[PDB]
Coordinates of C-alpha atoms and ligand atoms in Angstrom, one line a residue:
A90 CA 146.7 7.0 65.8
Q91 CA 147.5 5.6 69.3
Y92 CA 148.1 7.9 72.4
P93 CA 150.5 7.6 75.4
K94 CA 148.2 7.5 78.5
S95 CA 150.7 9.2 80.7
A96 CA 154.3 10.3 81.3
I97 CA 156.9 10.8 84.1
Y98 CA 158.3 13.6 86.4
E99 CA 162.1 13.5 86.5
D100 CA 162.4 14.6 90.1
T101 CA 160.1 12.1 91.9
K102 CA 159.5 9.5 89.1
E103 CA 155.7 9.5 89.8
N104 CA 153.2 9.3 86.9
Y105 CA 151.1 12.1 85.4
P106 CA 148.1 11.3 83.2
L107 CA 148.0 12.8 79.7
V108 CA 144.5 13.9 78.5
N109 CA 143.5 15.0 75.0
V110 CA 143.5 18.7 73.9
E111 CA 140.0 19.3 72.6
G112 CA 140.6 22.1 70.0
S113 CA 143.2 19.9 68.3
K114 CA 140.6 17.7 66.5
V115 CA 141.2 16.1 63.0
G116 CA 137.9 14.2 62.7
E117 CA 137.8 11.7 65.7
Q118 CA 141.6 11.9 66.1
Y119 CA 143.7 14.2 68.4
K120 CA 146.9 16.2 67.6
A121 CA 147.9 17.4 71.1
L122 CA 147.9 16.2 74.7
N123 CA 147.8 18.1 77.9
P124 CA 148.9 16.8 81.4
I125 CA 146.9 16.2 84.6
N126 CA 143.3 17.6 83.9
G127 CA 141.6 19.4 81.0
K128 CA 141.0 22.3 83.4
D129 CA 143.6 24.4 85.4
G130 CA 146.1 21.4 85.3
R131 CA 147.9 22.1 88.6
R132 CA 150.7 20.1 90.2
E133 CA 151.0 20.6 94.0
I134 CA 154.6 20.9 95.2
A135 CA 155.9 21.8 98.7
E136 CA 156.4 25.4 97.5
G137 CA 153.0 25.7 95.9
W138 CA 151.5 24.9 92.5
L139 CA 152.6 24.8 89.0
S140 CA 151.1 24.0 85.6
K141 CA 152.2 24.0 82.0
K142 CA 149.6 23.4 79.3
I143 CA 148.5 24.2 75.7
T144 CA 145.7 26.9 76.4
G145 CA 145.2 27.7 72.7
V146 CA 145.4 26.2 69.3
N147 CA 146.5 29.1 67.1
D148 CA 146.5 27.3 63.8
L149 CA 145.8 23.6 63.8
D150 CA 146.9 22.8 60.3
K151 CA 150.3 24.4 60.7
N152 CA 150.9 23.1 64.2
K153 CA 150.8 26.4 66.1
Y154 CA 150.1 26.3 69.8
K155 CA 150.0 28.7 72.8
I156 CA 151.8 27.4 75.9
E157 CA 150.7 28.6 79.3
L158 CA 153.0 28.2 82.4
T159 CA 151.9 29.2 85.9
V160 CA 153.5 29.3 89.4
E161 CA 151.7 29.9 92.7
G162 CA 153.5 30.0 96.0
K163 CA 152.8 29.5 99.7
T164 CA 153.4 31.2 103.1
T165 CA 154.0 29.7 106.5
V166 CA 154.8 30.8 109.9
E167 CA 157.9 29.2 111.5
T168 CA 158.4 29.9 115.2
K169 CA 161.6 31.9 115.9
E170 CA 162.7 29.7 118.9
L171 CA 163.7 26.5 117.2
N172 CA 160.9 25.4 114.8
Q173 CA 158.8 24.4 117.9
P174 CA 155.1 23.7 117.3
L175 CA 152.6 26.0 119.0
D176 CA 149.5 25.0 120.9
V177 CA 147.3 28.1 121.0
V178 CA 144.2 28.9 123.0
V179 CA 142.1 31.9 122.1
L180 CA 140.1 33.5 124.8
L181 CA 137.2 35.7 123.5
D182 CA 135.0 38.0 125.6
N183 CA 131.3 37.8 124.5
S184 CA 129.7 39.9 127.1
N185 CA 126.6 42.0 126.4
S186 CA 128.9 45.1 126.2
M187 CA 130.4 43.5 123.0
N188 CA 127.1 43.8 121.1
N189 CA 127.7 45.5 117.8
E190 CA 125.3 48.4 118.6
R191 CA 127.3 49.4 121.6
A192 CA 129.9 52.2 121.9
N193 CA 128.4 54.1 118.9
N194 CA 128.0 51.0 116.7
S195 CA 131.7 50.3 117.1
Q196 CA 131.1 46.7 116.1
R197 CA 133.1 45.0 118.9
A198 CA 131.8 41.5 118.6
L199 CA 132.0 41.4 114.8
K200 CA 135.4 42.9 114.6
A201 CA 136.9 40.8 117.4
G202 CA 135.4 37.7 116.0
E203 CA 136.9 38.5 112.6
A204 CA 140.3 39.3 114.1
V205 CA 140.2 35.9 115.9
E206 CA 139.3 34.1 112.6
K207 CA 142.2 35.8 110.8
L208 CA 144.7 34.9 113.6
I209 CA 143.3 31.3 113.7
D210 CA 144.1 31.1 110.0
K211 CA 147.6 32.5 110.1
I212 CA 148.3 30.2 113.1
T213 CA 147.1 27.1 111.3
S214 CA 148.9 28.0 108.1
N215 CA 151.5 25.7 109.7
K216 CA 150.1 22.2 109.6
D217 CA 151.8 21.5 113.0
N218 CA 150.4 24.3 115.2
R219 CA 147.2 23.6 117.1
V220 CA 144.3 25.9 118.2
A221 CA 141.5 25.9 120.7
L222 CA 138.9 28.5 121.4
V223 CA 137.2 29.6 124.6
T224 CA 134.3 32.2 124.4
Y225 CA 133.2 33.4 127.8
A226 CA 130.9 35.9 129.6
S227 CA 129.1 34.8 132.8
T228 CA 130.2 31.3 131.9
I229 CA 131.8 29.5 129.1
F230 CA 129.7 29.6 126.0
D231 CA 130.2 25.9 125.0
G232 CA 126.7 24.8 124.1
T233 CA 125.7 23.3 127.5
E234 CA 123.2 24.3 130.2
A235 CA 124.4 27.0 132.6
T236 CA 122.8 28.7 135.6
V237 CA 123.4 32.2 137.0
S238 CA 122.1 34.0 140.0
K239 CA 120.4 37.4 139.8
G240 CA 118.3 39.7 141.8
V241 CA 118.4 41.6 145.1
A242 CA 117.1 40.8 148.6
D243 CA 115.1 42.1 151.5
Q244 CA 116.7 42.8 154.9
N245 CA 116.8 39.2 155.9
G246 CA 118.4 38.3 152.6
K247 CA 115.3 36.8 151.0
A248 CA 115.9 36.9 147.3
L249 CA 113.6 38.6 144.8
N250 CA 113.8 39.8 141.2
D251 CA 112.8 43.5 141.3
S252 CA 112.6 43.9 137.5
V253 CA 109.2 44.6 136.0
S254 CA 110.1 42.2 133.1
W255 CA 110.5 39.2 135.4
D256 CA 108.5 37.4 137.9
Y257 CA 109.9 38.2 141.4
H258 CA 110.6 34.5 141.8
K259 CA 113.2 34.7 138.9
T260 CA 116.4 34.8 141.0
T261 CA 118.3 32.2 139.0
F262 CA 118.2 31.8 135.2
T263 CA 119.0 28.5 133.4
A264 CA 119.6 28.3 129.6
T265 CA 121.5 26.5 127.0
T266 CA 124.4 28.7 125.9
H267 CA 125.4 29.2 122.3
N268 CA 128.2 26.8 121.3
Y269 CA 130.9 29.4 120.7
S270 CA 133.8 27.3 122.0
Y271 CA 136.1 24.6 120.7
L272 CA 137.7 23.0 123.8
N273 CA 140.1 20.4 122.3
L274 CA 143.4 21.6 120.8
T275 CA 143.2 20.6 117.2
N276 CA 145.1 20.9 113.9
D277 CA 142.7 18.8 111.8
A278 CA 141.6 21.0 108.8
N279 CA 137.9 20.1 109.2
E280 CA 137.9 20.5 113.0
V281 CA 139.5 23.9 112.5
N282 CA 136.7 24.9 110.2
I283 CA 134.2 23.9 112.8
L284 CA 136.1 25.9 115.3
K285 CA 136.0 28.9 113.0
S286 CA 132.2 28.4 112.6
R287 CA 131.8 28.8 116.4
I288 CA 133.5 32.2 116.7
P289 CA 130.7 34.6 117.9
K290 CA 130.0 37.5 115.6
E291 CA 127.5 39.2 117.9
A292 CA 126.5 39.3 121.5
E293 CA 123.0 39.3 123.1
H294 CA 120.6 42.4 123.0
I295 CA 118.7 43.3 126.1
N296 CA 115.5 42.9 124.0
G297 CA 116.7 40.0 121.9
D298 CA 117.1 36.8 123.9
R299 CA 116.5 38.2 127.4
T300 CA 117.3 35.0 129.2
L301 CA 120.8 34.6 127.7
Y302 CA 121.2 38.3 128.2
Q303 CA 121.5 37.4 131.9
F304 CA 124.7 35.4 131.1
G305 CA 126.4 38.3 129.5
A306 CA 128.7 39.5 132.3
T307 CA 132.5 39.1 132.6
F308 CA 133.9 36.0 134.5
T309 CA 137.6 36.4 133.4
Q310 CA 138.7 33.9 136.0
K311 CA 136.7 31.0 134.6
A312 CA 138.0 31.6 131.2
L313 CA 141.7 31.9 132.3
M314 CA 141.1 28.6 134.2
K315 CA 139.8 27.0 131.1
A316 CA 142.7 28.0 129.0
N317 CA 145.1 26.7 131.7
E318 CA 143.2 23.4 131.9
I319 CA 143.3 22.8 128.2
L320 CA 147.1 23.4 128.0
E321 CA 147.8 21.4 131.2
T322 CA 146.0 18.3 130.0
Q323 CA 146.4 18.4 126.3
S324 CA 149.7 20.1 125.6
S325 CA 153.3 19.0 126.5
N326 CA 156.8 20.5 126.8
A327 CA 157.3 19.3 123.3
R328 CA 155.1 22.3 122.3
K329 CA 155.2 26.0 122.9
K330 CA 152.1 27.3 124.6
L331 CA 150.4 30.6 123.8
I332 CA 147.2 32.3 125.0
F333 CA 145.6 35.3 123.2
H334 CA 142.9 37.0 125.2
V335 CA 140.5 39.5 123.6
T336 CA 138.4 41.4 126.2
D337 CA 136.3 44.5 126.6
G338 CA 136.0 44.7 130.4
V339 CA 137.4 44.1 133.8
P340 CA 135.9 41.0 135.5
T341 CA 132.6 41.4 137.3
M342 CA 132.4 37.9 138.7
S343 CA 134.9 35.7 140.4
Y344 CA 135.6 32.5 142.4
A345 CA 135.7 33.0 146.1
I346 CA 138.9 32.6 148.2
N347 CA 138.2 29.8 150.6
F348 CA 138.3 31.7 153.9
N349 CA 137.3 29.5 156.7
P350 CA 134.9 30.9 159.3
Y351 CA 135.4 27.9 161.8
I352 CA 139.1 28.1 162.6
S353 CA 140.5 30.5 165.1
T354 CA 142.7 33.0 163.3
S355 CA 142.2 36.4 161.8
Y356 CA 141.2 36.3 158.1
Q357 CA 144.4 38.2 157.4
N358 CA 146.4 35.3 158.8
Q359 CA 144.4 32.8 156.7
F360 CA 145.2 35.0 153.8
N361 CA 149.0 35.3 154.5
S362 CA 148.9 31.6 154.9
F363 CA 147.4 31.0 151.5
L364 CA 150.1 33.1 150.0
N365 CA 153.0 31.5 151.9
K366 CA 152.2 28.2 150.2
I367 CA 153.6 29.8 147.0
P368 CA 157.4 30.3 146.4
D369 CA 157.0 34.0 145.5
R370 CA 154.1 34.6 147.9
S371 CA 152.2 36.4 145.0
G372 CA 149.1 34.2 144.5
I373 CA 146.8 31.6 145.9
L374 CA 146.7 28.0 144.9
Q375 CA 143.5 26.5 143.3
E376 CA 142.9 24.3 146.3
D377 CA 142.3 27.5 148.3
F378 CA 139.5 28.8 146.1
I379 CA 135.9 27.5 146.3
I380 CA 135.6 25.7 143.0
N381 CA 133.9 22.3 143.6
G382 CA 130.3 23.4 143.3
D383 CA 127.8 24.8 140.8
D384 CA 128.7 28.3 139.8
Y385 CA 125.4 29.9 140.7
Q386 CA 125.9 28.6 144.2
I387 CA 129.5 29.5 144.8
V388 CA 130.7 32.4 142.7
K389 CA 130.9 36.0 143.7
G390 CA 129.4 38.8 141.6
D391 CA 126.6 38.8 139.0
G392 CA 127.8 41.3 136.5
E393 CA 126.9 44.3 138.5
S394 CA 130.4 45.7 139.3
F395 CA 134.1 45.2 139.5
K396 CA 133.6 46.2 143.1
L397 CA 132.0 44.1 145.8
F398 CA 129.9 46.2 148.1
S399 CA 130.8 47.5 151.6
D400 CA 127.3 49.1 152.0
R401 CA 124.8 46.3 151.6
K402 CA 121.9 48.6 150.7
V403 CA 121.0 49.1 147.0
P404 CA 121.1 52.9 146.4
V405 CA 118.8 54.8 144.1
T406 CA 120.1 55.2 140.5
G407 CA 122.2 58.4 140.6
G408 CA 121.3 59.0 144.2
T409 CA 122.1 58.2 147.8
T410 CA 118.9 56.8 149.5
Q411 CA 118.0 53.1 149.6
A412 CA 116.1 51.8 146.6
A413 CA 112.7 50.2 147.4
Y414 CA 110.5 47.9 145.4
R415 CA 106.7 48.7 145.1
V416 CA 105.0 45.4 145.5
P417 CA 102.1 44.9 143.0
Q418 CA 98.8 44.7 144.9
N419 CA 98.0 41.3 143.5
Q420 CA 101.2 40.0 145.1
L421 CA 101.1 41.6 148.6
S422 CA 99.3 38.6 150.1
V423 CA 101.7 36.1 148.6
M424 CA 105.0 37.8 149.5
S425 CA 103.8 38.4 153.0
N426 CA 103.0 34.7 153.5
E427 CA 106.3 33.8 151.9
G428 CA 108.2 35.9 154.4
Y429 CA 109.3 39.0 152.7
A430 CA 110.1 42.1 154.8
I431 CA 107.4 44.4 153.5
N432 CA 107.2 47.9 155.0
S433 CA 103.8 49.4 154.0
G434 CA 103.7 48.1 150.4
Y435 CA 107.4 48.4 149.8
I436 CA 110.4 46.0 150.1
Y437 CA 113.7 47.7 150.9
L438 CA 116.4 46.4 148.7
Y439 CA 119.8 44.8 149.6
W440 CA 122.4 43.3 147.4
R441 CA 122.5 39.6 147.7
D442 CA 125.4 38.3 149.8
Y443 CA 127.3 37.1 146.8
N444 CA 127.9 40.8 146.0
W445 CA 129.0 41.8 149.5
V446 CA 132.5 42.5 150.6
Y447 CA 133.8 39.3 152.1
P448 CA 134.5 37.3 154.2
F449 CA 131.6 37.9 156.6
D450 CA 130.3 35.7 159.4
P451 CA 127.7 33.2 158.1
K452 CA 125.7 33.4 161.4
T453 CA 126.0 37.1 162.4
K454 CA 126.6 38.5 158.9
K455 CA 129.4 40.6 160.5
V456 CA 132.1 41.6 157.9
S457 CA 135.7 40.5 158.5
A458 CA 137.6 42.7 161.0
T459 CA 140.8 42.2 159.0
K460 CA 141.4 41.2 155.4
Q461 CA 138.6 42.0 153.0
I462 CA 138.1 41.2 149.3
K463 CA 136.7 44.3 147.7
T464 CA 137.0 43.6 144.0
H465 CA 137.0 40.8 141.5
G466 CA 140.4 41.7 140.1
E467 CA 142.2 40.8 143.4
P468 CA 141.1 37.1 143.5
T469 CA 141.4 36.7 139.7
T470 CA 145.0 38.0 139.9
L471 CA 145.8 35.8 142.9
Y472 CA 144.5 32.8 141.0
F473 CA 146.5 33.8 138.0
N474 CA 149.8 34.3 139.9
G475 CA 149.2 31.2 141.9
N476 CA 148.3 28.7 139.1
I477 CA 149.1 30.2 135.7
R478 CA 152.2 32.5 135.8
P479 CA 154.2 29.4 137.1
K480 CA 153.6 27.5 133.8
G481 CA 155.5 30.0 131.7
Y482 CA 152.8 30.2 128.8
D483 CA 153.1 33.3 126.6
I484 CA 150.0 35.3 127.3
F485 CA 148.9 38.3 125.2
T486 CA 145.9 40.4 126.0
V487 CA 144.1 42.8 123.6
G488 CA 141.6 45.0 125.3
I489 CA 138.9 46.9 123.4
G490 CA 138.3 50.3 124.7
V491 CA 138.9 49.0 128.3
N492 CA 138.1 51.7 130.8
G493 CA 137.0 50.1 134.0
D494 CA 133.2 50.3 133.6
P495 CA 131.5 49.2 135.8
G496 CA 133.3 50.1 139.1
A497 CA 137.0 50.3 138.3
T498 CA 139.0 53.4 137.3
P499 CA 140.9 53.3 134.0
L500 CA 144.1 52.9 135.9
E501 CA 142.8 50.0 138.1
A502 CA 141.7 48.4 134.8
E503 CA 145.0 48.7 133.0
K504 CA 146.9 47.2 136.0
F505 CA 144.4 44.3 136.1
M506 CA 144.8 43.6 132.5
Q507 CA 148.6 43.7 132.7
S508 CA 148.4 41.4 135.7
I509 CA 146.8 38.7 133.6
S510 CA 149.3 39.0 130.8
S511 CA 152.8 37.3 130.6
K512 CA 154.6 40.7 130.8
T513 CA 153.4 44.2 131.3
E514 CA 154.0 44.9 127.6
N515 CA 151.9 42.0 126.7
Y516 CA 148.6 43.9 127.1
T517 CA 147.4 46.5 124.6
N518 CA 144.2 48.5 124.9
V519 CA 142.9 49.7 121.5
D520 CA 140.8 52.8 121.0
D521 CA 139.4 51.6 117.6
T522 CA 138.1 48.2 116.8
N523 CA 140.0 48.0 113.4
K524 CA 143.3 47.8 115.2
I525 CA 142.2 44.7 117.1
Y526 CA 143.9 42.5 114.5
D527 CA 147.0 44.6 114.1
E528 CA 147.5 44.2 117.8
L529 CA 147.0 40.4 117.8
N530 CA 149.3 40.2 114.8
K531 CA 152.1 42.2 116.4
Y532 CA 152.1 39.8 119.4
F533 CA 152.0 36.7 117.3
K534 CA 155.0 38.1 115.3
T535 CA 157.0 38.2 118.5
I536 CA 156.7 34.4 118.3
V537 CA 156.7 33.6 114.6
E538 CA 158.3 34.7 111.3
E539 CA 156.4 34.8 108.0
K540 CA 158.2 32.8 105.2
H541 CA 157.1 32.9 101.6
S542 CA 157.9 29.7 99.8
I543 CA 159.4 31.2 96.6
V544 CA 162.3 33.6 97.2
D545 CA 164.3 34.7 94.2
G546 CA 163.0 31.7 92.2
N547 CA 163.8 30.8 88.6
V548 CA 161.8 28.9 85.9
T549 CA 163.7 27.2 83.1
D550 CA 161.7 26.3 80.0
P551 CA 163.8 24.9 77.2
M552 CA 162.1 24.0 73.9
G553 CA 161.8 20.3 73.0
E554 CA 163.9 18.9 70.1
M555 CA 161.2 19.2 67.4
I556 CA 160.0 22.6 68.7
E557 CA 160.4 26.1 67.4
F558 CA 159.8 29.0 69.8
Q559 CA 157.8 31.5 67.8
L560 CA 159.3 34.9 67.3
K561 CA 157.1 37.6 65.7
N562 CA 159.9 38.6 63.2
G563 CA 161.4 35.1 62.9
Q564 CA 164.8 36.5 64.0
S565 CA 165.0 38.3 67.4
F566 CA 163.4 37.6 70.8
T567 CA 161.4 40.6 71.9
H568 CA 159.0 41.5 74.7
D569 CA 156.2 41.0 72.2
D570 CA 157.0 37.3 72.0
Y571 CA 155.6 36.3 75.5
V572 CA 153.1 37.6 78.0
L573 CA 153.7 37.6 81.7
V574 CA 151.0 38.6 84.2
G575 CA 150.4 38.4 87.9
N576 CA 147.1 37.5 89.6
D577 CA 147.4 40.9 91.4
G578 CA 146.7 42.5 87.9
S579 CA 150.3 43.5 87.1
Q580 CA 152.2 42.7 83.9
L581 CA 155.5 42.9 82.3
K582 CA 155.3 45.7 79.7
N583 CA 158.4 46.0 77.7
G584 CA 160.4 44.2 80.4
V585 CA 159.2 46.5 83.1
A586 CA 156.6 45.6 85.7
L587 CA 153.7 47.9 86.0
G588 CA 150.3 47.6 87.8
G589 CA 149.2 45.9 91.0
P590 CA 147.6 47.8 94.0
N591 CA 150.5 50.2 94.6
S592 CA 151.3 51.0 90.9
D593 CA 154.7 49.6 91.4
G594 CA 154.5 46.3 89.5
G595 CA 153.4 44.2 92.4
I596 CA 154.2 40.5 92.4
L597 CA 156.3 41.2 89.3
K598 CA 158.6 44.0 90.5
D599 CA 162.1 43.1 89.2
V600 CA 160.9 39.9 87.6
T601 CA 162.4 39.4 84.2
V602 CA 161.8 37.0 81.2
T603 CA 165.0 36.2 79.2
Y604 CA 165.7 33.9 76.3
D605 CA 168.7 32.0 75.1
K606 CA 168.6 31.7 71.3
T607 CA 171.0 28.7 71.1
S608 CA 169.2 26.3 73.5
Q609 CA 165.8 27.9 72.7
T610 CA 165.1 28.4 76.5
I611 CA 162.8 30.9 78.0
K612 CA 163.4 31.8 81.6
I613 CA 161.6 33.6 84.4
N614 CA 164.0 35.2 86.9
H615 CA 163.6 36.6 90.3
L616 CA 160.2 35.3 91.4
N617 CA 159.1 36.2 94.9
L618 CA 155.7 34.6 95.5
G619 CA 153.9 34.3 98.8
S620 CA 150.4 32.9 99.6
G621 CA 147.9 33.3 96.7
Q622 CA 150.4 35.0 94.5
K623 CA 150.4 33.5 91.0
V624 CA 152.2 34.4 87.7
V625 CA 151.2 33.3 84.3
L626 CA 153.5 33.0 81.3
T627 CA 152.2 32.5 77.8
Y628 CA 154.2 32.2 74.6
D629 CA 153.9 30.6 71.1
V630 CA 155.4 27.5 69.6
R631 CA 155.5 25.6 66.2
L632 CA 156.3 22.0 65.5
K633 CA 159.5 21.9 63.4
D634 CA 159.3 20.7 59.7
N635 CA 161.6 17.6 60.1
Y636 CA 159.1 15.6 62.2
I637 CA 158.2 11.9 62.2
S638 CA 154.6 11.1 61.3
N639 CA 151.9 10.2 63.9
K640 CA 154.7 10.4 66.5
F641 CA 154.0 12.5 69.6
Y642 CA 156.8 15.0 70.3
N643 CA 157.4 16.7 73.6
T644 CA 156.9 20.5 73.7
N645 CA 159.7 21.2 76.2
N646 CA 162.9 19.6 77.4
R647 CA 163.1 19.3 81.2
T648 CA 161.2 22.4 82.6
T649 CA 162.0 23.2 86.2
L650 CA 161.4 25.7 89.1
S651 CA 164.1 26.6 91.6
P652 CA 162.0 28.0 94.4
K653 CA 164.9 29.6 96.1
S654 CA 167.8 29.9 93.6
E655 CA 170.2 31.4 96.2
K656 CA 169.0 29.7 99.5
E657 CA 169.0 26.2 98.0
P658 CA 170.2 26.1 94.4
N659 CA 169.8 22.3 94.5
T660 CA 166.0 22.3 95.2
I661 CA 164.5 21.6 91.7
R662 CA 160.8 20.9 90.8
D663 CA 159.6 19.5 87.5
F664 CA 156.8 20.9 85.4
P665 CA 154.5 18.6 83.5
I666 CA 155.1 18.8 79.7
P667 CA 152.5 18.6 76.9
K668 CA 153.1 16.8 73.6
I669 CA 152.1 17.4 70.0
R670 CA 152.1 15.5 66.6
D671 CA 151.1 15.9 62.9
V672 CA 151.0 14.1 59.5
Ligands
LI701 LI1 160.2 38.7 67.3
MG702 MG1 131.7 43.4 128.6

């Protein structure tokens, strides 16, 4: 009437506690003992989990118990080139166009966001890999205060907001952005969950938060820059470096090329000079962009177009003539005094200079007589070639119904997106937002291989010395004498797997359960178990007649798993073993 508190694994020598089996009660004394906990009873091993426990007392007086045995496996990704850890930065477009309503409720932001979450999970299925996330639009959505410039101007470039929803003075906006970024590379399980909680699932509505709606354009350059900065300062050559970029549009903002109006050469020469600093002459160094300022003061574009404007006059919507702003009567006096160029109640509207074709002379406003930057793709591609291509990062780009709106042709747009990927084949434009994840997964598969932890594995379960395996007829082992089921709802029926999603036997296809009458050993053969694939074996046992009183007997001899019985026959994991006794 005394109990052993615990026993010992034969593969690692570490202890496992033995609890009491409740249903085995003979008034305040216990007849059987289970290992680990009184619940699921799992033992974690490098290939997954395994348990072996009495789940049922069949007949207490006669010592008849029901053993349950379970095996659950794992998956990882190992990187094809030389088990090298990855450092991965996801770039996610969260522009207004990504709103779930848009493109006939195509659910861009939701679907993209979920693709990213899935990819982040797969990536981090390898404890070693690291992830970081940058969500962007007019700026990086990282939970800090940001400013953007908006509006139009009169003929002397005095700025006004011409929208009837805003005061005319509202020509910059300032807001705290949503925190949709995680800007340190991390592999910490908790930090990764935080990172996942920051992946946007929606974008702004024009009549939702109208302020943040002003920050919903596409500044692809700032994002690319941020991915580069994270890798450059946080990664190493120890690690392989990947960038996945999910986007729904061509850039509509960009950093300016730092043309210099005060030196005496053609802007085309200044340009050729920027390029000549680079081995391949394909790009412009960071030092030659205007970066060191506040975005609203220095950037080009405001979300309006991929194009910068030759004609500085705002045209009428679907028309040719110059748009004009009817001044409200109660504001005529004030705008006049302020200095606006008012022509009999109306202000004629020009694009603000940040949207003009450039360079142009700061004094005379005259456009360059030579080189002209006419799009936001050009400078973005130049920055990319100049500062990112060199580093050799693998760069995949999944576009979502990219077509060039606003201001690019579909062809112009495909070229741009190719130009900001590692190879031409590293950009794919999907026509349907359910393919977003397939596409991200193809590319990732390029770099990694999925490996299930249990490949042709074997369980060996010999009965303990005082134990009788129960046979329904006392003589022959039959398929009626054990039950094997998989957590995908498949089962061995008469030694043939049936069930699971494809009516093919699932998880249990070609698995077999065999028995050796002599050694009294039950075996599971041919297990192939990935992540969250689990198999459960139940059978019946009886304690043999020749037993010694109040002495706990083991239910099995050494019970083991061989996770890969071909790939590493020597890898052998122990199962915990219950114990029983009677008088
Ligand atoms: Li039988
Ligand atoms: Mg967009």
